[model samples]
Target: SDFDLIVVGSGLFGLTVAERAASQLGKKVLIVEKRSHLGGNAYSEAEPETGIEIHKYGAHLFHTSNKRVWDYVNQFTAFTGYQHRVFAMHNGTAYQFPMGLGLINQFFGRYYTPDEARELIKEQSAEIDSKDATNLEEKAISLIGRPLYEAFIRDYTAKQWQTDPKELPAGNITRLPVRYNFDNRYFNDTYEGLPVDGYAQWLSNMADHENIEVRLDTDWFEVREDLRAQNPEAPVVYTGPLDRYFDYSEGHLGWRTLDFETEVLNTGDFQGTPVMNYNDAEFPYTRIHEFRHFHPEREDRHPKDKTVIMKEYSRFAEEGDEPYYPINTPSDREMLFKYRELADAETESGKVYFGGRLGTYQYLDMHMAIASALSMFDNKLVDALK
Candidate 1:
């Protein structure tokens, strides 16, 4: 069937663009997803037995400062009003994550205010004399100083990225916030929450439109030429891995994918928290997520006999494995530049537009992805003739 536009994935980016192009602009759009489900990695399903919603890939907490993106998403689904709160487990002890005054005081057993915490961090960081910090360790020390970095970030980061902290770039540590105040909220965004009915249902509702046709379990490699032929006059928005598009021409980019081991426990509450990070290197897994705590409002309905939890382990992304996150190494950047050149050439030749985390090979939060799609829709598809 002919379409005005063809989107290659049904993740946040692809769906956002498809929605805008078809609903707002009245364009015929086709969204094809490789997975049988529509929400991609952000999909969630509740276990029938436990009634606990599990994040199929990993936990995704929706939080963003962009009002337009937030408003746009809210139209499709109401949120459960969840604030991202995470803890780090070090040597069998759990502590507040993101290194704040409360966490510092908790770890050391002292009631230090924000000012006192700032003073302590400043005093400890006074010796670091890097005019421009170059590595992850140096950047972290400059921000929160040596003690906090060693106590929380170093080992945790090593496990997450599968590399020594010294070997990683300083940009990776840029997301790590060092708040002097006692706020334990993980994200500082203006809006933070989860879908009321779960992410999969929310996405399905968003993708359900007369003008938008969705095909699940359809691999891009299988339908690329056929889709291009069917939608000959329309532009294609490609969101698959950039490396795979070119058959890994300049060698595959590095990434770290996570594996989850799930278990159902005979209790109403398992961990008493949503997420707990294991900071010690001795622990094989990185973190544990209790699915029941995601929807605190449903506490009463939570199965009194059982709860569900997932143990997360991060490992290097193998060739056949699904790539979750792109490991942004210096070498990857150099390789990506070459891919960008090729992508630019493709765009100039006129048929396809690249987007999303894997398409651009950049780590992007949900807000950024939606914002990017909206921008692309406005600039690229607004004037296209059907």
Candidate 2:
């Protein structure tokens, strides 16, 4: 065996593990990736004509409060000061998002103090206690009242889940985040930014060590037996689909995938913002992402006459779709439980370890994935290697 460690996927989690093993442990690592690129969904590239960076999979905003994760990522690349803010376009009007004072005041067309706004919501939401709610619609109404819920949540959520909120279970939503003040920033993380050079470079840097070798466009299942035979003592860090790894013996986990429709328009500016959420049911797409707004620092480099825009559409994943979100229904939870038991059994034998969103069937953000990988490297890999 030429390599000491084998990572199944080249995503953030896999990269973090491979980087740590190669650098800290001084072990030769081989990263086998099924995709052509190394960074998985976080991979981004410049629009050939426009020269603006676009997130190949959906929009990925980097933000984290975890000091360790933040510090670790900083070693790869410097990030730009790009704060994410979303706008909800409802009935031909744009409103500040996240149901805050800015949105409430604009929607109601009246000036209300913070206290007054709170009181208004309290009175409106007095109809049904959240505990008494039976469904998602009722639960949302009990939290933010009918007016706000209908205006902001109902249709948007309907589009997101492809089902009316009334039909969804109450357990789906514990709380509807509504701010009394005017803080409409998308994430409340301590640090928020994008890679200065680009996601591709940042991701590439992680696998740039001499001991690390990344093999792309190679499916792990086809080469798994061969690689495992060569490196019998090498511990496996598998980041592919958990159910797929076992060939879905228990049952296939439900997942919601995203369909992106991107177009390079002749106009330089569209939507006038990075992200615009359509609140009405008329628009099939949930939101429109303008790539140019993601990096204002690249304004000079981006073409003024041409800009790229992508419309995001969500739907249930089929056999050959890229799974994005986990639709963890009751049956899905039962399957997950069974899969976890199987995963534990595999790990107990000291042959394979699963860590990452796809491998665990959880929707983890970029930072969360990296942090989880670091923890796995520290807690699991270190002891196993020694």
Candidate 3:
């Protein structure tokens, strides 16, 4: 075999391992990607006419408290100090999101201190205890009041995914908060920014090393047998679908897919922010993103009356559709356990390793993917490759 490593999929997880192995271990790595270009979901390109950067997927905001990942990413491209703030459009009015005082005061037509708002919500939501909540709707109503739940979380979350809160698991609502104050910052992290240039350039820089060779539009399935035949023990870092790799030995894992309707609008300012969650169910789409607002530092140079916008519509992913979020149903988990047993045996045999959102069947943020790759590299591949 000519290469030290054969990597499948060129997403953040794949690129991280390839870049590390190439630059640190001095290994000749081959990255075979299904997409025509690099950077799986994080890929972005400039509009030919406006030159404004557009994320080909949906909006990807990078925010992390991981110092190691922050330092590591800075080596490729400097990030702009672009803190994210998302608003929700409800009943023809825009309100600050995440159930805070800014939203509370706007919706209630009065101002209240943090304590007052907290007491009010506590009294309202006292009927449903968070610990006792069995479903998504109960968990939400326990966290926020029934009024807020009906107004915001109820319809919005219903339109969000393939399943409703009543049918979905309770644990899914754990991460979000029902704040009492006016903090509207979408993320509270030590590092929060967009790449100064763009996601595509930043991703390209990671795979730019001499030892790494990337082949686009090359499906790993087409060549896996040949590579395995050449060297039975050659390690493959697979970031594709876990079940697909195993040929669905157990059963297909459920996944949620998003359809983005991207359009270049004539108006310069569309939503006035990068993300606007449509709280009402009538819109069909969950959120709308204005790409120009992502990098406000370049606002002076952008066209005065043109902007790029994308509306995200979510659905149950079919077999052929591009998988985005793992549905994580009880049945899906049972199947994943069987797949994990098979994957564990495969890894123990020193032939393959599974990772990333698709491989693990979990929704992961960008920073989490990078951290996971680093862990896999340090704990798993370092010993095997060395």
Candidate 4:
């Protein structure tokens, strides 16, 4: 066979499999990407005018507690010590987020001991048990008091889903963590950072191997037959939409997509931080991302007179919009299970495998996607190839 494996989509998942198969197993791998670029949503490029690296899809912050994933990614690109922190803007005041003592003290306008704050929240949230909550509003109110929920979670959740919390199901959220201390770090992971050079460089290094041939601006469906004929024994590892692969035979899975309005301002600094969450319902956009802040180490390389910022607006994904997050309603889950059944049967005879966030219909972080791809390579792809 000309190619030993065909990996569809050049996302992290596909890149990982292609890299492993080419280097470890010495198999010729063909990676097909519909987009003109590789790395899928994790791809980043510098703004032409400002030269500040911007996340084309959105921010892709790399963080993971798994030593295996941490060690694996380090081989591709060195990481910066960029700890993720967010601020929630409510009533024109910037408060440190994730419902910690820092936010609590500022919001309530009083300094309360950890024990006192805990007791206050306990008293406020004693109305309903979390298990008994009926809707998103109830669930959130039960977890955090009405005061905090209204100030932070309510409007933000509304904007993200573009629906009222009362209409959303209780299962939408599990626990809204509120810390008694001042820890406002977004992730609890052991390590967190952005790629030192950029995400594009890191992704390019993954596909740089003698046995790997990456084809950008190529759709798998358009040339599937020709590729199969050229390499009859080669198995396919598809990392595209699960529903689209089957031609929507089971109907579309619910998804939420983000619309980013990016602009370059003349000022050197826009927002002091990388991310700011708008908690007020009046604000049309959910959050704003300041690209220059993500990599402060590149202060010299980036322009001192201009900066780039993107305002993110979330809505239900329409026919042609790029799907961002899975809504995962009951109906969506039902559709996913049917697709899974079809996927399993297809694999039995077609020698095709589905993995990655889009293929599996799950919200996966960068580390999780890499881990899942590694698992597929170890448990499934190896047996098929070897």
Candidate 5:
């Protein structure tokens, strides 16, 4: 039997398209993934010892203002009303994030009203306007003032990208990226929650339809020719690295990869929070994730004095290494544009669609990936499949 569509990479983008084609269009679909499991970076599993779900690739929060996305995802799995909050570590102290009154008052040792706080920030940031800011450091200072930039952003951003913020472009972050209000909920989305069960379960449910066949440990590049031979007319949605798709005819694009050291500890609770971002340069790791806190509703059944934690580290992506969070340096952006041209001109005949973070060389949240896949399906795949 011929598959009507072939989706390379079992990440959210590929799964979304495959699930839609099989369920909505009634088209047989094949899903190929290099990883042994599904869900890509957003995959999570229960720690065997503690039975706590740990996000394998750092922390993935489901928050979206898109009503369609919120409603559409519910068809697969129910969600926990989990509102995410982050605590930033500064000088061995935990403070609320996003340049808000909480951090401002705690750091300066005074309580300031929302208006007063805004006025203080305006006065401090007057040294440089967001328009005149040349680099990320300047851009940050223009928005939050030099003191905040030096204390929180300077070293953090440097460690994150492994480059000085002065060398990076200001276009990525414009003005001060802070909230003036006391609300510390990390995301400002209409719908915010975690899957009621887990991400793995929710992702698997998407591909559980009879018409879809998933081939794990299958590298699309190694088998694209053979698969195409089996079904020449099938459209392929490639979600892997774009530079890799063309065999790196041009130079490689820059990407920042994360290394997580996950461990189980003998504690009922570790940080009393799901995620903590370390801002000081003294600490090697960028953040810590306490798995148990991610799902507080499970506390009734969860064991005592046993917890799971993960330390996240970021660095430049090397060859054969998994890529996450495209660095998108100015030169890399230039190279990406050229490759985009090549991709468009080269794959028109093959009925191939490029998408996802690696495919398009852009950072995408989980909801954003799903929404993008939905758009691709309705606008492109629906007509192309015919």
Candidate 6:
């Protein structure tokens, strides 16, 4: 079985690269996934009781400004126009995320214009030195003031990362946009939507081309030599954890993984919202997702018969658990730098290219992953022997 390329991991990165290689370049590519499914973290399935497609891992909202990336994805599946909205629960009350004027009014029980909201935030944040905001806590405080930061950002971040906000990098806090305007939309991208049939279906479709062959539950070590023998002249795109490629000689990087407890209820509605973030640390799970809200077009989706919900718990990734978010702490950076040095050395050794969230070990949304795959395909694999 000859192949022009072998792609490790069936996530967005690998799938995108395989699609471009086979479709445009007319190259034979093999995509191997450790998981049985295709979509990686963006996988989803419908609940039998409610028929609502639930995100198997967590909520994944597609939002991007890159038109090429957006257009490339649209070719495989139609998207349901969904603007993501989130709520943070504090002391049993739900407040709109992004901390808009509506949330301000709800929390303090007074209507405030955008201008008034701006002035209030400015007045509250006056004492916090923005230039000196080095840690996550200080950056959040400097951006949104003390009350909002404490009520919304602080506890949620601590629980999510399993560390005090002050210990984490300020980059984490700065990623969330803070606007004085009443727009409660979480992402401000020009393009925003989710796959109509869920991400798993979309990814399977992407890999259905004749030139692309997909194998699940396939270990890279088992087939590494055979695949190399099969595609001696073709480039290999590695999307697994970079440290694992080098057998963790520089030590494993820190990451946080999540566990979910799913339930189907007889009641029509579950949480009455798509996602509810529990800000209090006392709660074992960080958030609960109501699956039905993700897809409103399902015919069998009932308002009364049943509902599906997943309570999500976050923990530090251990030896066996699936790694989700990379910790990217200062110590993690030192270790990653050492790993990058090894990766660079490997490039000179032979036909391996590293990418994706785990391979690059950076937090990237779906669009960024596609963009990276496209760039890698054009810049690296296009000239590689087939």
List model 6 lDDT by residue over 90-120, tens digit each.
9888887867787888876798888988888
Q: On a 0 to 100 scale, what is the lDDT of residue 66 in model 3?
A: 99
- Cα shift from native, residue 77, model 2 (Å): 0.9
Q: Which ten residues in a row have the lowest lDDT in candidate 6?
A: 171-180
Per-prediction TM-score to the true structure, in the order listed: 0.94, 0.98, 0.96, 0.98, 0.96, 0.94
The Cα local distance difference test for each model comes to: 0.85, 0.92, 0.88, 0.92, 0.88, 0.83
What is the C-alpha RMSD, rounded to one decimal, of candidate 2? Answer: 1.1
Stretches of model 1 off by over 4 angstroms after superposition = 130-134, 174-176
Report the C-alpha lDDT of model 4 over 4-112, residue by residue, as the tens digit. Answer: 9999999999999999999999999999999999899999998999888999798889999999999999999999999999999999999988888889899988977
Candidate 5, superposed: residue stretches over 4 Å from native: none
Residue 274 shift from truth in candidate 4, angstroms: 0.7
lDDT of 3 by residue, 1-386 (tens): 56888889999999999999999898889898988999999999998767899887778899999999999999999999888898988999998887888988999889989999888787878989889999889988887768888888877888877567798778877754778778878898999999998999999999999999889998999988887677666689999999988999898899888898988899999878889999887889999988889998998889999998888998898868888888877888999999998999988866689999888898889999999999999988888786
TM-score of 5: 0.96
Model 5: lDDT of residue 354: 93
lDDT, candidate 4, residue 147? 92
Q: Which model is ahead, 1 or 3, in terms of lDDT?
A: 3
Model 6: pairs clashing at backbone N, Cα or C within 3 Å: none
Clashes of 5: 1
Give the better candidate number (3 or 4) by lDDT: 4
List clashing residue pairs in candidate 4: none
The all-Cα superposition gives candidate 5 an RMSD in Å to the true structure of 1.5
lDDT-wise, the better of 4 and 5 is 4
- In candidate 2, position 98 carries an lDDT of 78
Clash-forming residue pairs, model 3: none
- The weakest ten consecutive residues by lDDT in model 3 span 172-181
